[PDB]
């Protein structure tokens, strides 16, 4: 057991980036490119 | 500015801010619009406006 | 009272307050130059905001310039004419 | 504002008290945040707010003698009535000074319409995703989920050019 | 195209000294700008014209039945000319002279005109109304009689003189252009979005 003193670090800002199922935020230009755009999963897929 | 968060305020608060003539005298442009920062225990972010 | 100055005071790192050339001045009128040749009307020690004073000299002569003077905000007349002139003669 | 969500109904009505500072115009935006499995996403919306034109000080001018016509040279008294202490600026402008002048509209005729220019955003409200609608409403948000993209007699006119202090009830004679 | 500058420290109502017109004035629409001059923005702009307001006798208001002449108003267009005193009372009786004209644009102040009227009507109870057909005007003075050929303003001049006493007052309308295209549409207080 431990006493938390410092606050936990919040998640990174995903600014103007299509979020994937994991969290790998990449540029929006890769949407509907017909390939391994996110390189992790095809969750979003931009309905391409 | 400094705020206080508690269960009574439901973790929201608003503080008034002022922009006084502290800008550098002269220069090529006196705008230097703003750099806004937030000091919190769990998060920290900055943005220009 | 009226505000003249910055007026903002700033807290410094040395636990001191940086204050500029600020003062707290008035937004009541006082007695005029009170020349022996002129006569004020009405003759009151203190004047309130919104009242006017009719200054004139003795008989046979008429005041040069504006005949009526109005009490401004405070320590303010529209013309002052401090010992300038009342009347030489109006022929 | 802030409210709580219950399962009593699908739509909840919120009560918003209006103040004297919101006479010319206003805007309201309602946004709620949710907790996603991977990433969060908040939704917002805004619609214009129109109001009437009522003064806070409630300054009204009225002459003490009540008659349809006044005789030339008649001594009249004017009474000012305000809610709080305020400074007045009186101006007696003739109705005949209004020449053709392509209509000669008015001296000012506009106090709230020119005050409406303080609104940063344009349009009525509503729009695309939270960034676009907040930029259209005149705001910029900071959250972890989404970002915002910047993309001699008688008689000459005029007379009665004076400034006087006015208590709750002040009256002058001329 | 500046004349004088003056600054004053401020109550809430900034009082300024009375300005004086130079010995050689320039008639036209002047310009008044105000700035804080230290550090600020939002300069205010005010306008005032220098002209001769020596004696206005009575206000002459021209309120046409329709704003702009359309197809139905081409054969018959009735316009109301009312002259009223400044003390809220209408004019009992006065002779009203109507003058018509055709102008190409609002910038051009001098244009040819009929030359046909010169219509004389009498003001009754502070209100007068007369019927004016556009066909005779467009056929006589305009040199071509068709509503599609002429797309330009219509200038009307009104000279009202009193029959019981020597007086004269004039009024005018900026212009009414014959446009084949109908009036334009726009949206106000309407969000162009869907729920």
Curated annotation (Swiss-Prot), chain A:
Q: Which disease is it linked to?
A: Complement component 7 deficiency: A rare defect of the complement classical pathway associated with susceptibility to severe recurrent infections, predominantly by Neisseria gonorrhoeae or Neisseria meningitidis.
Q: Which domain of life is it from?
A: Eukaryota
Species for this entry: Homo sapiens
Chain's gene name:
C7
Source organism phylogeny: Eukaryota, Metazoa, Chordata, Craniata, Vertebrata
Kindly provide the PTM information from the record. C-, N- and O-glycosylated. O-glycosylated with core 1 or possibly core 8 glycans.
Q: Where does the record say this protein resides?
A: Secreted; Target cell membrane
Boundaries of each LDL-receptor class A domain copy?
12-48
Disulphide bonds in the chain = 14-25, 20-38, 32-48
- The family this protein is said to belong to: Belongs to the complement C6/C7/C8/C9 family.
User: How does it associate, per the subunit comment?
Assistant: Monomer or dimer; as a C5b-7 complex it can also form multimeric rosettes. Component of the membrane attack complex (MAC), composed of complement C5b, C6, C7, C8A, C8B, C8G and multiple copies of the pore-forming subunit C9.
Q: What does this protein do?
A: Component of the membrane attack complex (MAC), a multiprotein complex activated by the complement cascade, which inserts into a target cell membrane and forms a pore, leading to target cell membrane rupture and cell lysis. The MAC is initiated by proteolytic cleavage of C5 into complement C5b in response to the classical, alternative, lectin and GZMK complement pathways. The complement pathways consist in a cascade of proteins that leads to phagocytosis and breakdown of pathogens and signaling that strengthens the adaptive immune system. C7 serves as a membrane anchor.
Q: Which residues of the full protein are shown?
A: 72 to 119 of 843
Q: Which residues cross the membrane?
A: none
Q: Where is the composition biased (Acidic residues)?
A: 37-48
Q: Under which name does UniProt file this protein?
A: Complement component C7
From Swiss-Prot, chain C:
Cystine bridges: 29-71, 57-86
- Disease cited in the entry: Complement component 7 deficiency: A rare defect of the complement classical pathway associated with susceptibility to severe recurrent infections, predominantly by Neisseria gonorrhoeae or Neisseria meningitidis.
Q: Where in the cell is it found?
A: Secreted; Target cell membrane
Q: What does this protein do?
A: Component of the membrane attack complex (MAC), a multiprotein complex activated by the complement cascade, which inserts into a target cell membrane and forms a pore, leading to target cell membrane rupture and cell lysis. The MAC is initiated by proteolytic cleavage of C5 into complement C5b in response to the classical, alternative, lectin and GZMK complement pathways. The complement pathways consist in a cascade of proteins that leads to phagocytosis and breakdown of pathogens and signaling that strengthens the adaptive immune system. C7 serves as a membrane anchor.
Q: Tell me which stretches of the chain form a coiled coil.
A: none
> Which domain of life does this protein belong to?
Eukaryota
Region annotation (CCP 2) maps to: 14-91
Q: Report the sequence similarity comment from the record.
A: Belongs to the complement C6/C7/C8/C9 family.
What stretch of the whole protein does this chain cover?
603 to 693 of 843
Posttranslational modification: C-, N- and O-glycosylated. O-glycosylated with core 1 or possibly core 8 glycans.
Summarize subunit and interaction data from the UniProt record for this chain.
Monomer or dimer; as a C5b-7 complex it can also form multimeric rosettes. Component of the membrane attack complex (MAC), composed of complement C5b, C6, C7, C8A, C8B, C8G and multiple copies of the pore-forming subunit C9.
Q: Could you identify this protein by its name?
A: Complement component C7
Provide the Sushi domain boundaries.
Answer: 27-88
Curated annotation (Swiss-Prot), chain D:
Coiled-coil boundaries = none
What is the protein name for this chain?
Complement C5 beta chain
Query: What is the organism lineage in this UniProt record?
Result: Eukaryota, Metazoa, Chordata, Craniata, Vertebrata
Question: Gene encoding it?
Answer: C5
């Amino acid at each position: 057991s431990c006493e938390p003193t410092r606050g936990c670090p919040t998640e990174e800002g995903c600014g103007e980036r299509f979020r994937c199922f994991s969290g790998q935020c990449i540029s929006k230009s890769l949407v509907c490119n017909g390939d391994s755009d996110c390189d992790e999963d095809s969750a979003d897929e931009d309905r391409c | 500015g400094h705020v206080h968060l508690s269960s009574e305020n439901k973790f929201q608060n608003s503080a008034i801010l002022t922009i006084q003539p502290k800008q550098l005298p002269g220069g090529q442009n006196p705008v230097s619009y703003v750099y806004l920062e937030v000091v919190s225990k769990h998060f920290s972010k900055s943005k220009r406006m | 009272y009226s505000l003249i100055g910055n007026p903002v005071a700033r807290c410094g790192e040395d636990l001191r307050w940086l204050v500029g050339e600020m003062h707290c001045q008035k937004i009541a009128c006082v007695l005029p130059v009170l020349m022996d040749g002129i006569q004020s009307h009405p003759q009151k020690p203190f004047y309130t905001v919104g009242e006017k004073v009719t200054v004139s000299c003795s008989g046979g002569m008429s005041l040069e310039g504006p005949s009526a003077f109005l009490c401004g905000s405070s320590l303010k007349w529209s013309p002052e004419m401090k010992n300038a002139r009342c009347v030489q003669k109006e022929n | 504002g802030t409210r709580e969500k219950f399962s009593d109904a699908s739509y909840q009505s919120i009560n918003i008290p209006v103040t004297q500072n919101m006479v010319p115009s206003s805007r309201l935006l309602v946004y709620y945040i949710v907790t996603g499995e991977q990433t969060a996403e908040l939704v917002s919306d805004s619609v214009w707010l129109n109001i009437e034109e009522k003064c806070g000080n409630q300054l009204q001018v009225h002459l003490s003698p009540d008659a349809d016509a006044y005789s030339p040279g008649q001594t009249v008294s004017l009474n000012m009535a305000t809610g709080m202490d305020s400074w007045v600026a009186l101006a007696a402008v003739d109705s005949a000074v209004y020449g053709v002048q392509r209509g000669a509209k008015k001296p000012l005729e506009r106090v709230f319409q020119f005050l409406e220019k303080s609104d940063l955003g344009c349009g009525a409200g509503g729009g695309l995703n939270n960034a676009n609608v907040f930029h259209l409403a005149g705001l910029t948000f900071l959250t972890n989920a989404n970002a915002d993209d910047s993309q001699r007699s008688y008689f000459p006119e005029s007379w009665l050019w004076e400034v006087h202090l006015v208590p709750r009830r002040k009256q002058l004679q001329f | 195209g500046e004349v004088d500058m003056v600054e004053e420290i401020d109550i809430g109502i900034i009082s300024f000294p009375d300005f004086k017109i130079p010995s050689n004035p320039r008639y036209g629409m002047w310009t008044i700008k105000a700035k804080y001059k230290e550090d600020f923005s939002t300069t205010g702009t005010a306008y005032f014209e220098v002209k001769e307001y020596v004696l206005p006798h009575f206000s002459v208001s021209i309120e046409p039945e329709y704003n702009f002449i359309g197809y139905k108003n081409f054969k018959n267009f009735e316009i109301t000319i009312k002259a009223r005193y400044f003390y809220n009372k209408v004019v009992t009786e006065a002779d009203v002279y109507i003058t018509f004209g055709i102008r190409e644009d609002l910038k051009d102040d001098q244009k040819e005109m009929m030359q046909t009227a010169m219509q004389n009507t009498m003001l009754i109870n502070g209100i007068a109304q007369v019927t004016f057909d556009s066909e005779t005007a467009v056929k006589e003075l305009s040199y071509y009689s068709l509503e599609d050929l002429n797309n330009k303003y219509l200038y009307i001049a009104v000279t009202v003189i009193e029959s019981t006493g020597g007086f004269s007052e004039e009024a005018e309308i900026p212009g009414i252009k014959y446009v084949l295209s109908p009036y334009k549409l726009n949206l106000v207080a309407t969000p162009l979005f869907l729920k």
